[PDB]
Amino acid sequence: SMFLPPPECPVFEPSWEEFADPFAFIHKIRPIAEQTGICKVRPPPDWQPPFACDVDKLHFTPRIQRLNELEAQTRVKDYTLRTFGEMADAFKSDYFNMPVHMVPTELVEKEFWRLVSTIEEDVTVEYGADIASKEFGSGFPVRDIKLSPEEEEYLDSGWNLNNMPVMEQSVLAHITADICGMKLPWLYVGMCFSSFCWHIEDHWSYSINYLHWGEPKTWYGVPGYAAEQLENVMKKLAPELFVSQPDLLHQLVTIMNPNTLMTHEVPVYRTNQCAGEFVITFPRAYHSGFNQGFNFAEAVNFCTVDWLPLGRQCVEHYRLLHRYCVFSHDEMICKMASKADVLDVVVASTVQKDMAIMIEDEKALRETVRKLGVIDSERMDFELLPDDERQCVKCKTTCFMSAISCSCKPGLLVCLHHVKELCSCPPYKYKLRYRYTLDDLYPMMNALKLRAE
Ligand SMILES: O=C(O)CC[C@@H](O)C(=O)O
Ligand SMILES: [Cl-]
Ligand SMILES: [Mn+2]
Ligand SMILES: [Mn+2]
Ligand SMILES: [Zn+2]
Ligand SMILES: [Zn+2]
């Protein structure tokens, strides 16, 4: 009883009919899978996207990783695929003194949790993690070169992870702001023990991960409802990770044994994802894991209509924590409203409900700041400002609906929750900067209603 493996997460094997629409399928399994945080999806047996690449022309800059439980790592920050693969196979082979396909997955798991907890061991490994570029592209077929019929079959698949974030049931689709770190797929070259620390996705989005080829990836996941339980356990064991961070490039994360969570009554599930299988993580579902050997995976974030209310809650949670946003949720909502006529109807219906809450909150906030003595106001096109020029001084939220400025501190803004935090001038010197009047906003919401019918 060194390591007691968590119970297995749900595994789905959709029929071709079920599989034909990824968003319908994800909606269908949600009641089950949101209880476990992660789930595994095996596509129909003949869904087999062709993979092809020259192992000598693909190069990438590896990240180095120390394997110590509870030690701080930063979430985001030269080999060819062949030379990495050679290093990776030799590492595993020498570590166990065995051929690679002979090392049992149970053993690699048990040994991982041993080595990260033992101070005397100092194993370091390497891995790749980068968004698709011309130097290293998607593992799925994309359009340009002369493609074979096989590749053409998979070009428009919903499960082709390049398409997932442009589909009609997707919400993150119409965002015009630059969120490239979030809407483009990431490519991951793994090796034995290379690991991803406990985290949730930005803005509590979904993620979906496809293992193109190689040895399995071992996952642990925690359902969304238990996120704060996990954070409380982790805060007690590693408070350093929870100090305020200067930006998004300084997110601190760590390796932590799932048995520790289970001891503290945090529900945790596991799975081994093999080549050709999907793993899906649900909103605010903590997950971590490690690779069993040399492999190649591809993952992307996405947001469904189910996620919309959670996205709003997330930004509220970021504000309470003074965490930076990747994008403005309200700006996304208003962009969609301005495109109501071309929106999918269920999407239009869900956006309308979120917009109604947005407007009612904004109404109350503006009444409050008026009572504080802010009188002067001027329209402002917040979406034109670079993000770093429209973050609240206090809580760092990305402003869009409104903010307060003072001629006293040129360029500085606070959101309407932090009117007292801008400067020492009396509020009558302040200006309310707003994107829309309430009277602009109600017709926008009405367009959505008409589209939703
Ligand atoms: O985070 C990683 O490094 C692996 C990707 C995983 O977190 C995912 O959400 O697909
Ligand atoms: Cl160690
Ligand atoms: Mn993730
Ligand atoms: Mn505060
Ligand atoms: Zn603020
Ligand atoms: Zn001032």
Short mmCIF file of C-alpha atoms and ligand atoms in Angstrom, two decimals:
data_model
loop_
_atom_site.label_atom_id
_atom_site.label_comp_id
_atom_site.label_asym_id
_atom_site.label_seq_id
_atom_site.Cartn_x
_atom_site.Cartn_y
_atom_site.Cartn_z
CA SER A 1 0.00 0.00 0.00
CA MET A 2 2.52 2.60 -1.11
CA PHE A 3 0.08 3.94 -3.71
CA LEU A 4 -3.61 3.08 -3.86
CA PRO A 5 -4.79 3.96 -7.37
CA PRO A 6 -7.91 6.15 -7.51
CA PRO A 7 -11.07 4.59 -8.98
CA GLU A 8 -11.37 4.71 -12.78
CA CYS A 9 -13.05 7.68 -14.48
CA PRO A 10 -15.97 7.03 -16.92
CA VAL A 11 -15.14 5.62 -20.36
CA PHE A 12 -17.44 6.22 -23.31
CA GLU A 13 -17.55 4.35 -26.60
CA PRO A 14 -19.93 6.36 -28.77
CA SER A 15 -21.51 4.84 -31.86
CA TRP A 16 -20.84 6.55 -35.17
CA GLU A 17 -24.19 8.29 -34.83
CA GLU A 18 -23.39 9.58 -31.32
CA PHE A 19 -19.87 10.49 -32.40
CA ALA A 20 -20.98 12.55 -35.41
CA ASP A 21 -21.65 15.61 -33.24
CA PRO A 22 -19.05 16.23 -30.51
CA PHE A 23 -21.02 18.99 -28.76
CA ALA A 24 -24.22 16.97 -28.65
CA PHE A 25 -22.21 14.04 -27.31
CA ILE A 26 -20.46 16.12 -24.66
CA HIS A 27 -23.80 17.55 -23.57
CA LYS A 28 -25.15 14.00 -23.34
CA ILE A 29 -22.39 12.60 -21.09
CA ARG A 30 -22.19 15.73 -18.94
CA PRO A 31 -24.44 14.50 -16.12
CA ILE A 32 -22.08 11.53 -15.65
CA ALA A 33 -18.74 13.08 -16.48
CA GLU A 34 -19.15 16.31 -14.51
CA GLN A 35 -19.33 14.13 -11.38
CA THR A 36 -15.79 12.86 -12.08
CA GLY A 37 -14.19 15.91 -13.67
CA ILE A 38 -12.49 13.96 -16.46
CA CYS A 39 -13.67 11.21 -18.79
CA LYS A 40 -12.22 9.16 -21.60
CA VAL A 41 -13.71 8.84 -25.08
CA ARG A 42 -12.87 6.05 -27.49
CA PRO A 43 -13.88 6.96 -31.04
CA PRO A 44 -15.52 4.36 -33.32
CA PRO A 45 -12.93 1.77 -34.46
CA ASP A 46 -12.68 3.07 -38.03
CA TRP A 47 -12.31 6.73 -37.04
CA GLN A 48 -8.60 6.84 -37.73
CA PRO A 49 -7.18 10.23 -38.65
CA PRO A 50 -3.93 9.79 -40.59
CA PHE A 51 -0.82 11.00 -38.84
CA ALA A 52 2.23 11.89 -40.90
CA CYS A 53 5.34 13.90 -40.15
CA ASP A 54 9.08 13.89 -40.77
CA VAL A 55 10.74 13.17 -37.45
CA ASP A 56 13.90 14.91 -38.64
CA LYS A 57 12.36 18.22 -39.72
CA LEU A 58 10.16 18.79 -36.67
CA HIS A 59 12.12 20.57 -33.98
CA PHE A 60 11.24 22.10 -30.63
CA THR A 61 12.77 23.59 -27.51
CA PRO A 62 12.38 21.27 -24.56
CA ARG A 63 11.35 22.30 -21.07
CA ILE A 64 13.29 20.80 -18.16
CA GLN A 65 11.32 19.46 -15.23
CA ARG A 66 12.35 18.43 -11.72
CA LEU A 67 10.13 15.75 -10.22
CA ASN A 68 9.45 16.74 -6.58
CA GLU A 69 6.06 16.59 -4.88
CA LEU A 70 4.79 19.96 -3.58
CA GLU A 71 7.63 21.86 -5.31
CA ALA A 72 6.60 25.00 -7.22
CA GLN A 73 6.60 24.93 -11.01
CA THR A 74 5.43 27.61 -13.44
CA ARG A 75 2.60 26.53 -15.76
CA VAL A 76 3.74 28.07 -19.06
CA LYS A 77 7.09 29.41 -20.28
CA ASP A 78 16.69 22.03 -29.01
CA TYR A 79 15.55 18.56 -30.14
CA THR A 80 14.20 17.06 -33.33
CA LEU A 81 11.33 14.64 -32.77
CA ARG A 82 13.78 11.82 -33.55
CA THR A 83 16.51 12.93 -31.15
CA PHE A 84 13.96 13.58 -28.38
CA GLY A 85 12.53 10.11 -29.00
CA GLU A 86 15.98 8.55 -28.79
CA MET A 87 16.65 10.36 -25.50
CA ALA A 88 13.22 9.42 -24.18
CA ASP A 89 13.42 5.69 -24.97
CA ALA A 90 16.97 5.40 -23.60
CA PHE A 91 15.90 7.18 -20.40
CA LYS A 92 13.03 4.78 -19.74
CA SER A 93 15.02 1.73 -20.84
CA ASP A 94 17.91 2.59 -18.52
CA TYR A 95 15.65 3.59 -15.63
CA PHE A 96 14.00 0.19 -15.41
CA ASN A 97 16.69 -1.92 -17.12
CA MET A 98 13.95 -3.28 -19.40
CA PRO A 99 12.71 -2.90 -22.99
CA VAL A 100 10.16 -0.01 -23.04
CA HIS A 101 6.96 -2.01 -23.94
CA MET A 102 7.72 -4.40 -21.17
CA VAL A 103 7.41 -1.86 -18.34
CA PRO A 104 3.91 -2.35 -16.84
CA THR A 105 1.82 0.81 -16.54
CA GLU A 106 0.98 -0.02 -12.91
CA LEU A 107 4.71 -0.08 -12.16
CA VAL A 108 5.47 3.24 -13.85
CA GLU A 109 2.62 4.82 -11.82
CA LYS A 110 3.74 3.34 -8.50
CA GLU A 111 7.32 4.38 -9.22
CA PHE A 112 6.34 7.91 -10.22
CA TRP A 113 4.66 8.51 -6.89
CA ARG A 114 7.65 6.98 -5.13
CA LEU A 115 10.24 9.10 -6.88
CA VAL A 116 8.45 12.45 -6.54
CA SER A 117 8.04 11.96 -2.77
CA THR A 118 11.59 10.78 -2.03
CA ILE A 119 13.98 13.66 -1.24
CA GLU A 120 17.05 11.55 -2.03
CA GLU A 121 15.92 11.09 -5.64
CA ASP A 122 16.48 13.96 -8.08
CA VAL A 123 15.10 12.77 -11.40
CA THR A 124 14.80 15.43 -14.07
CA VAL A 125 13.00 14.88 -17.37
CA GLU A 126 12.14 16.98 -20.44
CA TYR A 127 9.08 17.56 -22.60
CA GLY A 128 7.62 19.69 -25.34
CA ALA A 129 4.66 22.02 -25.08
CA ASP A 130 3.89 24.60 -27.78
CA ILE A 131 1.00 25.94 -29.84
CA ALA A 132 0.82 24.84 -33.45
CA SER A 133 3.17 26.84 -35.66
CA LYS A 134 4.87 26.42 -39.04
CA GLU A 135 7.87 24.95 -37.21
CA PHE A 136 5.61 22.37 -35.55
CA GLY A 137 2.05 21.88 -36.76
CA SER A 138 -1.18 20.16 -35.74
CA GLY A 139 -1.18 16.37 -35.74
CA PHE A 140 -4.58 16.54 -37.45
CA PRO A 141 -5.06 17.31 -41.17
CA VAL A 142 -5.32 21.01 -42.03
CA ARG A 143 -5.88 22.78 -45.37
CA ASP A 144 -3.06 23.99 -47.68
CA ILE A 145 -0.81 21.39 -49.36
CA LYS A 146 -2.02 18.65 -51.74
CA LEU A 147 -3.94 16.39 -49.34
CA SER A 148 -4.82 12.72 -49.87
CA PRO A 149 -8.48 11.55 -49.76
CA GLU A 150 -7.89 10.04 -46.29
CA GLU A 151 -6.77 13.43 -44.91
CA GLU A 152 -9.69 15.16 -46.62
CA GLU A 153 -12.13 12.91 -44.74
CA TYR A 154 -10.90 14.27 -41.39
CA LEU A 155 -10.53 17.92 -42.37
CA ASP A 156 -13.98 18.90 -41.19
CA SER A 157 -14.43 16.44 -38.37
CA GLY A 158 -15.71 18.07 -35.20
CA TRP A 159 -13.16 15.93 -33.37
CA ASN A 160 -10.34 17.34 -35.47
CA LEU A 161 -9.14 19.56 -32.65
CA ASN A 162 -8.51 22.51 -35.02
CA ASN A 163 -12.22 22.65 -35.85
CA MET A 164 -13.59 22.30 -32.30
CA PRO A 165 -13.01 26.03 -31.69
CA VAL A 166 -14.91 27.29 -34.78
CA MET A 167 -17.94 25.01 -34.59
CA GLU A 168 -21.44 26.47 -34.31
CA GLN A 169 -22.21 25.11 -30.82
CA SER A 170 -18.92 26.59 -29.63
CA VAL A 171 -19.01 29.90 -27.75
CA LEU A 172 -15.32 30.89 -27.87
CA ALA A 173 -15.78 30.94 -31.65
CA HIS A 174 -16.64 34.55 -32.35
CA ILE A 175 -14.10 36.15 -29.99
CA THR A 176 -12.25 38.70 -32.12
CA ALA A 177 -9.76 39.60 -29.38
CA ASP A 178 -6.38 37.88 -29.44
CA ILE A 179 -6.65 34.79 -27.26
CA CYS A 180 -4.29 32.63 -29.34
CA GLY A 181 -2.81 30.89 -26.29
CA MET A 182 -6.33 29.63 -25.67
CA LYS A 183 -8.14 29.07 -28.99
CA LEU A 184 -5.31 27.30 -30.87
CA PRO A 185 -4.40 23.68 -30.12
CA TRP A 186 -1.25 22.92 -28.13
CA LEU A 187 1.13 20.10 -29.04
CA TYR A 188 2.79 18.02 -26.32
CA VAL A 189 5.76 15.69 -26.81
CA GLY A 190 5.96 13.44 -23.72
CA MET A 191 8.52 11.10 -22.16
CA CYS A 192 8.43 8.70 -19.18
CA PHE A 193 7.43 10.65 -16.00
CA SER A 194 7.07 14.06 -17.72
CA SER A 195 4.12 15.50 -15.90
CA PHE A 196 1.48 18.15 -15.82
CA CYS A 197 0.80 19.68 -12.40
CA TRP A 198 -2.64 20.10 -10.88
CA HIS A 199 -4.54 22.87 -12.66
CA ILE A 200 -7.85 23.99 -14.09
CA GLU A 201 -8.27 25.66 -17.47
CA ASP A 202 -8.29 29.41 -17.99
CA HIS A 203 -11.77 30.87 -17.50
CA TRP A 204 -12.80 27.40 -16.30
CA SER A 205 -13.14 26.23 -19.87
CA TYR A 206 -13.37 22.63 -21.05
CA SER A 207 -10.34 20.96 -22.48
CA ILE A 208 -10.09 18.00 -24.84
CA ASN A 209 -6.88 16.09 -25.36
CA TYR A 210 -6.09 13.56 -28.10
CA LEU A 211 -3.17 11.18 -27.86
CA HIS A 212 -2.00 10.80 -31.46
CA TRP A 213 0.53 8.05 -30.82
CA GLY A 214 2.96 6.54 -28.35
CA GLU A 215 2.80 5.19 -24.83
CA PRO A 216 -0.14 6.11 -22.56
CA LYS A 217 -0.76 9.26 -20.55
CA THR A 218 -1.91 8.70 -16.97
CA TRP A 219 -4.52 11.17 -15.69
CA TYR A 220 -5.99 12.18 -12.37
CA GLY A 221 -9.11 14.33 -12.19
CA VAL A 222 -11.34 15.97 -9.60
CA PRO A 223 -14.94 17.05 -10.32
CA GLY A 224 -15.71 20.77 -10.53
CA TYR A 225 -17.82 20.71 -7.40
CA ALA A 226 -14.75 19.78 -5.32
CA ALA A 227 -12.39 22.43 -6.69
CA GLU A 228 -12.31 24.54 -3.54
CA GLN A 229 -11.82 21.44 -1.36
CA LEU A 230 -8.72 20.61 -3.38
CA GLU A 231 -7.44 24.17 -3.19
CA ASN A 232 -7.90 24.16 0.57
CA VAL A 233 -5.98 20.89 0.91
CA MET A 234 -3.20 22.22 -1.29
CA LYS A 235 -3.05 25.63 0.43
CA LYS A 236 -2.43 23.88 3.73
CA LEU A 237 0.39 21.73 2.35
CA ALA A 238 1.99 24.34 0.06
CA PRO A 239 0.99 27.96 0.88
CA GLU A 240 3.80 29.39 -1.30
CA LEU A 241 1.78 28.45 -4.40
CA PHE A 242 -1.05 30.70 -3.32
CA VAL A 243 0.76 34.04 -3.03
CA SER A 244 -0.30 36.86 -5.37
CA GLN A 245 1.23 36.64 -8.85
CA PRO A 246 2.50 39.60 -10.94
CA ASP A 247 0.94 38.19 -14.15
CA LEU A 248 -0.37 35.14 -16.02
CA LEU A 249 3.18 34.08 -16.89
CA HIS A 250 3.79 33.42 -13.21
CA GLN A 251 1.08 30.91 -12.32
CA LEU A 252 2.52 28.49 -9.76
CA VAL A 253 1.51 24.83 -9.84
CA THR A 254 2.67 21.56 -8.30
CA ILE A 255 2.77 17.77 -8.28
CA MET A 256 0.64 16.24 -5.54
CA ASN A 257 -0.23 12.62 -4.72
CA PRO A 258 -3.94 11.85 -5.31
CA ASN A 259 -3.87 9.69 -2.16
CA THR A 260 -3.28 12.91 -0.21
CA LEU A 261 -6.48 14.32 -1.68
CA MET A 262 -8.37 11.09 -1.06
CA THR A 263 -7.20 11.12 2.59
CA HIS A 264 -8.84 14.54 2.87
CA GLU A 265 -12.07 13.28 1.31
CA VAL A 266 -11.49 14.96 -2.07
CA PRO A 267 -12.94 12.69 -4.78
CA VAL A 268 -10.29 11.76 -7.35
CA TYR A 269 -10.51 9.58 -10.47
CA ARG A 270 -7.83 8.14 -12.78
CA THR A 271 -7.38 6.79 -16.28
CA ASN A 272 -4.72 5.62 -18.70
CA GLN A 273 -5.30 7.36 -22.01
CA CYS A 274 -3.92 5.26 -24.87
CA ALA A 275 -3.05 6.29 -28.43
CA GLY A 276 -6.22 7.13 -30.36
CA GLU A 277 -8.25 8.05 -27.29
CA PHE A 278 -9.67 11.36 -26.09
CA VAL A 279 -9.75 12.73 -22.59
CA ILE A 280 -12.20 15.55 -21.81
CA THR A 281 -11.91 17.77 -18.75
CA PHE A 282 -15.00 19.65 -17.57
CA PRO A 283 -15.22 23.24 -16.22
CA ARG A 284 -13.16 23.86 -13.05
CA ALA A 285 -12.18 20.16 -12.94
CA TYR A 286 -8.69 19.90 -11.49
CA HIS A 287 -6.43 17.43 -13.31
CA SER A 288 -2.82 16.34 -13.35
CA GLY A 289 -0.85 13.39 -14.65
CA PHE A 290 2.28 12.10 -16.29
CA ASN A 291 3.34 10.32 -19.45
CA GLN A 292 4.27 6.63 -19.43
CA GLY A 293 6.84 7.03 -22.20
CA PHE A 294 7.59 8.76 -25.52
CA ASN A 295 4.33 10.09 -26.97
CA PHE A 296 2.60 12.90 -28.88
CA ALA A 297 -0.59 14.61 -27.85
CA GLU A 298 -2.71 17.57 -28.88
CA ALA A 299 -5.13 19.52 -26.77
CA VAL A 300 -7.39 22.55 -26.99
CA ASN A 301 -9.73 24.54 -24.77
CA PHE A 302 -13.35 25.10 -25.68
CA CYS A 303 -16.53 26.58 -24.30
CA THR A 304 -20.07 25.29 -24.78
CA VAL A 305 -23.38 27.01 -23.91
CA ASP A 306 -23.43 24.97 -20.70
CA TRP A 307 -20.24 26.81 -19.72
CA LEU A 308 -21.54 30.39 -20.18
CA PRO A 309 -22.83 30.91 -16.62
CA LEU A 310 -19.63 29.36 -15.23
CA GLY A 311 -17.51 31.68 -17.33
CA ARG A 312 -19.26 34.63 -15.65
CA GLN A 313 -18.73 33.07 -12.20
CA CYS A 314 -15.06 32.48 -13.02
CA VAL A 315 -14.41 36.12 -13.83
CA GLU A 316 -16.09 37.06 -10.55
CA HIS A 317 -13.77 34.58 -8.82
CA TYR A 318 -10.74 36.08 -10.60
CA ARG A 319 -11.77 39.51 -9.32
CA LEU A 320 -12.03 38.30 -5.72
CA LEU A 321 -8.52 36.83 -6.13
CA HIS A 322 -7.05 39.74 -8.12
CA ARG A 323 -6.15 37.35 -10.96
CA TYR A 324 -5.64 38.55 -14.55
CA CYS A 325 -8.20 37.56 -17.21
CA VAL A 326 -7.35 36.08 -20.57
CA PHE A 327 -10.26 37.96 -22.14
CA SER A 328 -13.28 40.02 -21.17
CA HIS A 329 -16.33 37.78 -20.71
CA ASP A 330 -18.73 40.75 -21.14
CA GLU A 331 -16.94 41.80 -24.33
CA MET A 332 -17.48 38.27 -25.68
CA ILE A 333 -21.19 38.37 -24.72
CA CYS A 334 -21.68 41.74 -26.45
CA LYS A 335 -19.80 40.62 -29.58
CA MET A 336 -22.18 37.68 -29.87
CA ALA A 337 -25.21 39.94 -29.29
CA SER A 338 -23.97 42.15 -32.14
CA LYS A 339 -24.01 39.01 -34.34
CA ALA A 340 -27.34 37.68 -33.09
CA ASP A 341 -28.73 37.08 -36.60
CA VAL A 342 -26.05 34.50 -37.51
CA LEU A 343 -25.89 32.75 -34.14
CA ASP A 344 -27.13 29.23 -33.64
CA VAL A 345 -30.55 29.49 -31.97
CA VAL A 346 -29.73 27.60 -28.76
CA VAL A 347 -26.60 29.70 -28.49
CA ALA A 348 -28.66 32.90 -28.95
CA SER A 349 -31.02 31.73 -26.22
CA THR A 350 -28.20 31.05 -23.74
CA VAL A 351 -26.34 34.29 -24.51
CA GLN A 352 -29.57 36.20 -23.93
CA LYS A 353 -29.89 34.76 -20.42
CA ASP A 354 -26.28 35.69 -19.53
CA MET A 355 -26.71 39.15 -21.05
CA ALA A 356 -29.80 39.71 -18.90
CA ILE A 357 -27.74 39.07 -15.76
CA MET A 358 -24.92 41.26 -17.07
CA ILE A 359 -27.28 44.17 -17.69
CA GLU A 360 -28.97 43.88 -14.32
CA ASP A 361 -25.62 43.79 -12.50
CA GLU A 362 -24.35 46.73 -14.54
CA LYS A 363 -27.50 48.73 -13.76
CA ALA A 364 -26.96 48.23 -10.02
CA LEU A 365 -23.23 49.07 -10.21
CA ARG A 366 -23.86 52.31 -12.07
CA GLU A 367 -26.54 53.35 -9.56
CA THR A 368 -24.05 52.70 -6.77
CA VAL A 369 -21.22 54.78 -8.26
CA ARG A 370 -23.63 57.66 -9.01
CA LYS A 371 -24.56 57.66 -5.33
CA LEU A 372 -20.85 57.87 -4.52
CA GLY A 373 -20.78 61.20 -6.32
CA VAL A 374 -19.43 60.26 -9.73
CA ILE A 375 -21.43 62.42 -12.10
CA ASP A 376 -19.46 63.10 -15.24
CA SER A 377 -19.48 60.31 -17.88
CA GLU A 378 -18.25 59.58 -21.42
CA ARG A 379 -18.63 56.67 -23.82
CA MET A 380 -15.48 54.65 -24.34
CA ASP A 381 -14.68 51.86 -26.81
CA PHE A 382 -12.88 49.60 -24.33
CA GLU A 383 -12.30 46.88 -26.94
CA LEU A 384 -9.77 49.14 -28.72
CA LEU A 385 -7.48 49.37 -25.69
CA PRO A 386 -4.71 46.82 -25.27
CA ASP A 387 -5.53 44.59 -22.28
CA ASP A 388 -2.75 46.05 -20.14
CA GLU A 389 -4.35 49.46 -20.60
CA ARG A 390 -7.77 48.43 -19.26
CA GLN A 391 -7.09 46.39 -16.15
CA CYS A 392 -8.57 47.55 -12.85
CA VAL A 393 -5.79 48.96 -10.66
CA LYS A 394 -7.07 46.98 -7.68
CA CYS A 395 -8.49 43.66 -8.87
CA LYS A 396 -6.85 43.43 -12.34
CA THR A 397 -10.14 42.53 -14.11
CA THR A 398 -10.26 43.40 -17.81
CA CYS A 399 -12.76 46.25 -18.07
CA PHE A 400 -15.34 46.48 -20.85
CA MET A 401 -18.83 47.48 -19.70
CA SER A 402 -17.50 50.38 -17.61
CA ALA A 403 -14.70 51.85 -15.53
CA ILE A 404 -13.77 54.95 -13.55
CA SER A 405 -10.94 57.31 -14.53
CA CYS A 406 -9.49 60.46 -13.00
CA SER A 407 -7.62 63.20 -14.90
CA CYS A 408 -5.25 63.01 -11.91
CA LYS A 409 -3.94 59.56 -12.97
CA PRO A 410 -3.92 59.51 -16.78
CA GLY A 411 -4.51 56.07 -18.27
CA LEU A 412 -5.39 54.37 -14.98
CA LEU A 413 -8.77 52.68 -14.51
CA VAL A 414 -10.72 50.91 -11.81
CA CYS A 415 -13.76 48.73 -12.29
CA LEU A 416 -16.97 49.87 -10.62
CA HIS A 417 -16.31 47.58 -7.64
CA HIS A 418 -13.22 49.60 -6.78
CA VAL A 419 -14.14 53.25 -7.20
CA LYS A 420 -12.41 54.02 -3.85
CA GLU A 421 -9.07 52.62 -5.06
CA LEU A 422 -8.13 54.94 -7.90
CA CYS A 423 -6.81 58.08 -6.17
CA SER A 424 -7.36 60.52 -3.33
CA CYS A 425 -9.43 63.02 -5.37
CA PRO A 426 -13.11 63.49 -4.52
CA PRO A 427 -15.44 61.39 -6.74
CA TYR A 428 -16.84 64.50 -8.48
CA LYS A 429 -13.50 64.71 -10.30
CA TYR A 430 -14.05 61.18 -11.71
CA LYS A 431 -15.56 60.12 -15.02
CA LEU A 432 -17.68 57.06 -15.61
CA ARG A 433 -16.37 55.55 -18.85
CA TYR A 434 -18.95 53.19 -20.35
CA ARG A 435 -19.17 51.09 -23.49
CA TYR A 436 -22.99 51.19 -23.79
CA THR A 437 -25.88 53.02 -22.23
CA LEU A 438 -28.54 50.77 -20.70
CA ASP A 439 -30.74 51.95 -23.58
CA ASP A 440 -28.17 50.62 -26.10
CA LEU A 441 -28.10 47.31 -24.27
CA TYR A 442 -31.79 46.37 -24.20
CA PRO A 443 -32.18 46.31 -28.02
CA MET A 444 -29.04 44.14 -28.25
CA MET A 445 -30.61 41.62 -25.94
CA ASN A 446 -33.87 41.84 -27.93
CA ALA A 447 -32.09 40.81 -31.13
CA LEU A 448 -30.99 37.61 -29.36
CA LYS A 449 -34.55 36.99 -28.21
CA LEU A 450 -35.85 37.36 -31.78
CA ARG A 451 -33.19 34.97 -33.08
CA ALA A 452 -33.97 32.52 -30.26
CA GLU A 453 -37.67 33.04 -31.06
O1 LIG B 1 -1.51 20.56 -19.14
C1 LIG B 1 -0.68 19.80 -19.83
O2 LIG B 1 0.52 19.97 -19.84
C2 LIG B 1 -1.35 18.71 -20.61
C3 LIG B 1 -2.70 19.10 -21.22
C4 LIG B 1 -3.88 18.84 -20.28
O3 LIG B 1 -3.80 19.69 -19.14
C5 LIG B 1 -5.18 19.03 -21.03
O4 LIG B 1 -6.06 19.81 -20.43
O5 LIG B 1 -5.37 18.49 -22.10
CL CL B 2 12.22 13.61 -5.51
MN MN B 3 -5.35 20.97 -18.69
MN MN B 4 -11.11 43.78 -2.63
ZN ZN B 5 -11.67 46.12 -9.74
ZN ZN B 6 -7.47 61.79 -8.95
#
